[PDB]
Amino acid sequence: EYKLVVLGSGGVGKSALTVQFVQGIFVEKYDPTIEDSYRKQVQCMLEILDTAGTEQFTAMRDLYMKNGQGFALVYSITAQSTFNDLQDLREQILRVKDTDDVPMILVGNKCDLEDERVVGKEQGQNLAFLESSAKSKINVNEIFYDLVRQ
Amino acid sequence: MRMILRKPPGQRTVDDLEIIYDELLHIKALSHLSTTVKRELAGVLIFESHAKGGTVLFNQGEEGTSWYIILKGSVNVVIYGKGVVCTLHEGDDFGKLALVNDAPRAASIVLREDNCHFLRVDKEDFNRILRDVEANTVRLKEHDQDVLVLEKVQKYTVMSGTPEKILEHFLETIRLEPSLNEATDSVLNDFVMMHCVFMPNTQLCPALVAHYHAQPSQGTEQERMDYALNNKRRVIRLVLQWAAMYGDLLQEDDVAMAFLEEFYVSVSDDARMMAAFKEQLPELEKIVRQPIRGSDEVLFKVYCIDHTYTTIRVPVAASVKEVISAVADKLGSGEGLIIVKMNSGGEKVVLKSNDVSVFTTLTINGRLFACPREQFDSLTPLPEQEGPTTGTVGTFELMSSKDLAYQMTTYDWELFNCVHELELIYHTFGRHNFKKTTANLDLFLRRFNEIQFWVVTEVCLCSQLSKRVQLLKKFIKIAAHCKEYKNLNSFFAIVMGLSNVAVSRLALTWEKLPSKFKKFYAEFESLMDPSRNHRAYRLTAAKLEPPLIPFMPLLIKDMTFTHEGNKTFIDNLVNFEKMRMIANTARTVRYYRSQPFNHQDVRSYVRQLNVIDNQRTLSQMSHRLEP
Ligand SMILES: Nc1ncnc2c1ncn2[C@@H]1O[C@@H]2COP(=O)(O)O[C@H]2[C@H]1O
Numbered sequence A: 001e002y003k004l005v006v007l008g009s010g011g012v013g014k015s016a017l018t019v020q021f022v023q024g025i026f027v028e029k030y031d032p033t034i035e036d037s038y039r040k041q042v043q044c045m046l047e048i049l050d051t052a053g054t055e056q057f058t059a060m061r062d063l064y065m066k067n068g069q070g071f072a073l074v075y076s077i078t079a080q081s082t083f084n085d086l087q088d089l090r091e092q093i094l095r096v097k098d099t100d101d102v103p104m105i106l107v108g109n110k111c112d113l114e115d116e117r118v119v120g121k122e123q124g125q126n127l128a129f130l131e132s133s134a135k136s137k138i139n140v141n142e143i144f145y146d147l148v149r150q
Numbered sequence B: 001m002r003m004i005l006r007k008p009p010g011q012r013t014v015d016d017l018e019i020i021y022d023e024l025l026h027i028k029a030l031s032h033l034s035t036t037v038k039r040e041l042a043g044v045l046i047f048e049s050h051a052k053g054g055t056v057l058f059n060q061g062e063e064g065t066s067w068y069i070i071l072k073g074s075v076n077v078v079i080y081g082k083g084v085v086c087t088l089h090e091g092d093d094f095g096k097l098a099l100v101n102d103a104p105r106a107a108s109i110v111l112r113e114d115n116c117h118f119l120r121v122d123k124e125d126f127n128r129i130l131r132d133v134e135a136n137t138v139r140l141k142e143h144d145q146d147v148l149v150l151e152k153v154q155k156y157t158v159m160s161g162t163p164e165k166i167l168e169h170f171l172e173t174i175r176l177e178p179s180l181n182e183a184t185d186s187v188l189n190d191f192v193m194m195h196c197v198f199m200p201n202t203q204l205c206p207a208l209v210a211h212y213h214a215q216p217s218q219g220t221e222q223e224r225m226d227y228a229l230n231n232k233r234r235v236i237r238l239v240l241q242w243a244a245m246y247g248d249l250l251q252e253d254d255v256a257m258a259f260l261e262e263f264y265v266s267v268s269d270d271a272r273m274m275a276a277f278k279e280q281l282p283e284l285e286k287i288v289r290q291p292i293r294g295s296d297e298v299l300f301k302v303y304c305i306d307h308t309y310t311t312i313r314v315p316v317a318a319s320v321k322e323v324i325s326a327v328a329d330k331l332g333s334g335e336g337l338i339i340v341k342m343n344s345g346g347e348k349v350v351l352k353s354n355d356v357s358v359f360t361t362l363t364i365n366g367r368l369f370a371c372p373r374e375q376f377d378s379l380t381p382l383p384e385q386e387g388p389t390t391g392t393v394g395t396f397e398l399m400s401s402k403d404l405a406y407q408m409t410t411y412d413w414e415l416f417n418c419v420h421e422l423e424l425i426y427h428t429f430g431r432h433n434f435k436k437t438t439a440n441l442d443l444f445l446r447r448f449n450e451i452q453f454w455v456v457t458e459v460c461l462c463s464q465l466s467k468r469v470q471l472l473k474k475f476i477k478i479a480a481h482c483k484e485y486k487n488l489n490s491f492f493a494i495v496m497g498l499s500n501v502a503v504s505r506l507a508l509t510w511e512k513l514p515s516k517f518k519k520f521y522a523e524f525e526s527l528m529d530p531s532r533n534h535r536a537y538r539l540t541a542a543k544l545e546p547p548l549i550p551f552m553p554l555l556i557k558d559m560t561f562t563h564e565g566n567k568t569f570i571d572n573l574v575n576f577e578k579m580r581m582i583a584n585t586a587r588t589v590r591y592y593r594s595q596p597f598n599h600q601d602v603r604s605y606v607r608q609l610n611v612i613d614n615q616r617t618l619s620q621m622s623h624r625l626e627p
């Protein structure tokens, strides 16, 4: 039994990644109202707690942060804003559960499109680092593999 | 051989049946069927032959009484108002859909050429042998393109299709019989609600008019008169459902109102002349806190860097570009302005010209700013945004926990009933795509944060430890009474307020709280367990009866993931499987409001909360209450 949490600003790819991992877009219809919606066996069971759609409700992310064990700080590489929003989330994790060390991973989503790129690999590396893509299914599984190891 | 198949089913010999079965093995339309099924078909399959081209097998609108396979020749699939829609050839089958859905024939089948041979299976035979084993997808085609795709999910339901064919399908399948009023409305409800995503009024209204005036291209005078009359009865039925769904929201749509006003004239004129629509004309005549409309106007303040402001008067549904324009009018300038939202904590977001109805999407203490891009990083919050500095315990402590929770739920219900079903659709698929307001949803969703932060504010402004324990005790009571009134939203808002880092830190307060209320809260916190897709909450809400306010952030989550997890278009066709899922979620909200809900000093307090939503401030206040 494991609980991983996906964090980041809106329009980043949190939900796309979440669905792409647990089931996959298009290949099957996605029903987010059933018990197994966010659970995927991998050799152990994982529940993905995603703050997509509920970013405006600060209490929702905190509840997920409490119950979380792994954390994914996702950002778009077409948006300068999203990289700068990560520092705060990093801190807020170390407050709800109240510790010094917490298993997490930085994630750079939307790498497939680079004719709209404004952020570089440079900056993310300076801050675990992956340049993933939810739609192109690049590194989607890898993101959640690193967290169970940690 | 022909004679053998021309014999009545009950007149077939054992040797006849053996010969027929062997032939059925060469027919490729039957190859997906079992041995068992195929020999049952041997004593049922009827050989039909027609010599003349242009011979009619069946007409549109007729009852589905047969399924056909083409042995020799070809047929035209003919639909009123579009002629030959496609042709079927040797090896193809038709007539399945009407039979299985017990629906009228959606098209006519006419012999394309001279001398055609068919294998026919009549209805009662099809239903006992093939009904749940010939489960081929029904793929209706026009101009060698898929146009409607139907599957067993037991009848065939629309999985995907073009907006036009989806409409044609839901029109034809309307049953007018009074005993089916509920069933008909339920079937249409998905299209009626979800059309704004795939077939907006600018297309739907012209289409409805075209269908209303559609005439059959086949039949005797009476046969034609009756078909057209019933076609008209069906279109009126859909318009009524369409009009009911929108309600007051039609006022926001000039195209839709123009259509409806003219449609009423059409129908009233036709009623007089054809001596019809006696039940439906009066229903249509009827149609020809309070919810905020997109056309309503607001006096909104937009702030400059030096904290002076402009008051603008614009519609609620105004775009950011329209807001920028209104600011540029009063400041009298054309010097590249951007609109930026700002939190009490100084966090800034640049809004895009594309965005509409932004006023209600601000945080509780958020403000709107207009500045050139160079000023973005220098912007600093207004003192107004930082919330109260002294508590209000002295006021609401003197108020009953039961009275507070009741006035909360009363106010919550007024706010919840202001939210239109369609606002959930608009919010999920993005406001800019519809240019419609979700102001009612925006404000109701904001209320969850308001209640949450109200709790945290009052606790953090309460310096006396004795009274602070009395506060925690009182909130838990207010929460408990909210859960009783079935206001789960406000219940979770209080619980989550107590869960807040600034409140959960205060050990000396929590420890001094009676273990009676320690256990109450621990149970409340367990109802929040995100485990197994919030199973704890979902089971709780399922048990409850109609008049209830659900946990709103979870509803918004479901909607978000239904949208991102599923494509809107599959093969350039509307993914109607997705459309149903969204519609189901909205209907759940409809079910929660299907029943109504059963001290002016308490009312005024509950409806005028002044709250700190700055987490940094609340954490610092918490730290000097208990270091
Ligand atoms: N059984 C039939 N159903 C519909 N149209 C038919 C039939 N038999 C002949 N037709 C003619 O074929 C025409 C094809 O184009 P229309 O639908 O405009 O009008 C149609 C009729 O005039």
Ligand SMILES: Nc1ncnc2c1ncn2[C@@H]1O[C@@H]2COP(=O)(O)O[C@H]2[C@H]1O
Pocket (backbone or CB within 6 Å): B064, B077, B079, B085, B086, B093, B094, B095, B096, B097, B098, B099, B104, B105, B106, B107, B108, B139, B140, B141, B142, B147
């Ligand atoms: N575009 C189409 N619309 C309606 N029917 C079609 C279409 N293409 C093929 N058909 C076939 O024509 C049949 C007419 O009767 P049914 O609706 O029972 O089943 C229909 C299909 O088998």
